[PDB]
Amino acid sequence: QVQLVQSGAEVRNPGASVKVSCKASGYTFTSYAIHWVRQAPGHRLEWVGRINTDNGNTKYSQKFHGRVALSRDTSASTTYMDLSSLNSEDTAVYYCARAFYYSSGVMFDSWGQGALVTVSSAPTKAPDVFPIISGCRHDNSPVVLACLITGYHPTSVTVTWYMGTQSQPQRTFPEIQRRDSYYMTSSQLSTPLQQWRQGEYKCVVQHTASKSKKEIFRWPESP
Amino acid sequence: QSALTQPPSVSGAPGQRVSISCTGGSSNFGAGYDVHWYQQLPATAPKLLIYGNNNRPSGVPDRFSGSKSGTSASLAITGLQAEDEGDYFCQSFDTSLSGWIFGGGTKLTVLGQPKAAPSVTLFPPSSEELQANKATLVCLISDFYPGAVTVAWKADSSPVKAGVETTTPSKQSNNKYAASSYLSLTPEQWKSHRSYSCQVTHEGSTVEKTVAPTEC
């Protein structure tokens, strides 16, 4: 059977390099070309290049330009992708596909499992917690309390809201990596607030990676 | 155009017929290159689904059918099965870029519960954050099914796409989904506009919330 296997996941610093392999098996390695495709989180798939697995001719995507290089080793039955001068946008999963022919053109009939590459230069840091609020305390519009949790590394955090001593239902939200390789997420108190009490409700943020617990029990008067 | 366009979400009851549209530019579909379709099941490599407009590899069920005419192609899936739930995208070739091009991707959901439109709350920058010379708008989205939305920001009436960082949907404890989107701004830009608006789109309806610097 036709099967493509790639190297494991890599973690690098900004401006560095990474070399990911793509081992083929089950067919003639020099008969069919190999392409490289990446997909960033929140983006579609992006083509990198095609390498002629026989004479060695390579065609690169114009967007990458001098950043990427595609090599071949026929004896090793493997293709490589070397990407230099990394940055936050290069955090993606990199695939390799085989070019197979059909009656009218070119076809990708086999894809690798993919290799994740993370461009992170973040030390273990505790999160900053800011009290955010929706609505006025001056209207009959309900007030929604939330806590903004940004500037930490690594994942994850653990949030619990409290009214005095009892725990209160909350809403969990995903965590996203920012451009500066730091993470952030939010937590929202579920029940909308009818009245105004001072110091009654509080969000508690726990980040065991830095052995710290940061809690907020006051929402300042609005700007 | 020089790229493909797909609906972000396509839903269907178990057993019904659904459709996915791939819109192409003259430089691609009007350029003689046929369209390929690939499915990406959860945590799997993309699988070749349909090659050459309407041909089917040995291993793909006949429920998947393909068509292409003019400049728009459509992928049809009859008798919807729970195994079909995943992401689907189209591929072609462009002559102006001399390279391959892919579509935005479409999440197919097999309904297991009735649909729920998202509930949205928009948050202004906090007082403590502004004193730290920072400003971030928080758009929180929760309790929607199927799990796929599209967030669009705008300053006053003009759209803004810089500094937007949206999260992928994550299944909640009650099989519904939640997401969020953030607009990072400088404290100068925040007070330099009369209002900001988060715009969430989901299954044929868009809800928008607005916050103003002068508001509270």
Residue-by-residue DSSP string for A67-78: GEEEEEETTTTE
Last residue of a domain, one of A100, A119, A138: A119
CA distance A79 to A96: 9
Q: Which fold has domain B2-112?
A: Immunoglobulin-like (2.60.40)
Close Cβ partners of B82 (under 8 Å, ≥ 6 residues apart): B14, B110
> Cβ separation of A103 and B52 shorter than 8 Å?
yes
What's domain B113-214's architecture? Sandwich (2.60)
Structure tokens of A195? 């009245």
Shared domain check, A93 and A33: yes
The 3-state secondary structure of chain B reads CCCCECCCEEEECCCCCEEEEEECCCCCHHHCCCCEEEEECCCCCCEEEEECCCECCCCCCCCEEEEEECCEEEEEECCCCHHHCEEEEEEEEECCCCEEEECCCEEEEECCCCCECCEEEEECCCHHHHHCCCEEEEEEEEEEECCCCEEEEEECCEEECCCEEECCCEECCCCCEEEEEEEEECHHHHCCCCCEEEEEECCCCEEEEEECCCCC
> Cβ separation of B126 and A133 shorter than 8 Å?
yes
DSSP for residue A41? T
The counts of H helices and E strands in chain A are 0, 20
How many other C-beta atoms are found inside a 10 Å radius of the C-beta of residue B87? 15
Q: Is residue A95 part of a domain?
A: yes
CA distance B104 to B8: 8
Label residues B1-21 b or e (16+ Cβ within 10 Å = b). Answer: eebbebeebbbbeeeeebebb
Residue spans of the domains in chain B: they are 2-112, 113-214
Structure tokens of A70? 């595609």
Q: Does an H or E element contain A177, and which?
A: strand A176-177
**Cα A111 to chain centroid, rounded:** 21
Method: X-ray
Distance from CA of A173 to the nearest CA of B (A): 6
Shared domain check, A166 and A82: no
Distance from CA of B120 to the nearest CA of A (A): 11
Task: Write phi, then psi, for B74 (nearest 5 degrees).
Answer: -140, 140
Q: Determine the straight-line distance between the first and last CA of chain A, rounded to whole angstroms.
A: 65
**Residue indicated by tokens 């083929």:** A24
Structure tokens of A92? 């993606």
Q: Which residues pair with A184 in a beta bridge?
A: A150, A176
CA distance B51 to B44: 19
How many other C-beta atoms are found inside a 10 Å radius of the C-beta of residue A109? 17
Nearest CA in chain A to B167: A176
Contact, B185 vs B191, CB < 8 A?
no
- CATH assignment of the domain containing A181: 2.60.40.10
Domain span at residue A36 reads 3-119
CA distance B100 to B94: 6
Structure tokens of A179? 């451009």
From the list A106, A98, A107, A117, the residue with the least C-alpha distance to A39 is A117
CA distance A157 to A178: 16
> Cβ separation of A174 and B168 shorter than 8 Å?
yes
Chain A contact for B2, CB < 8 A? no
Q: Exposed, middle or buried by CB within 10 Å (0-12, 13-18, 19+), for B47?
A: middle
Q: Beta strand pairing status for A105-111 and A45-51? A: unpaired
Distance from CA of A112 to the nearest CA of B (A): 6
Distance from CA of B14 to the nearest CA of A (A): 28
Give A-chain residues touching B38 at CB under 8 angstroms. Answer: 108, 111
Residue-by-residue DSSP string for A87-146: -GGG-EEEEEEEEEEETTEEEEEEE---EEEEE-----BPPEEEEEEES-------BEEE
Label residues A208-220 b or e (16+ Cβ within 10 Å = b). Answer: eeeeeebebeebe
**Residue indicated by tokens 């502004």:** B130
Contact, A203 vs A147, CB < 8 A?
yes
Contact, A68 vs A80, CB < 8 A?
no
CA distance A99 to B93: 13
| A-contacting residues in B 153-192 (Cβ below 8 Å) | 165-170, 172-173, 178-180, 182
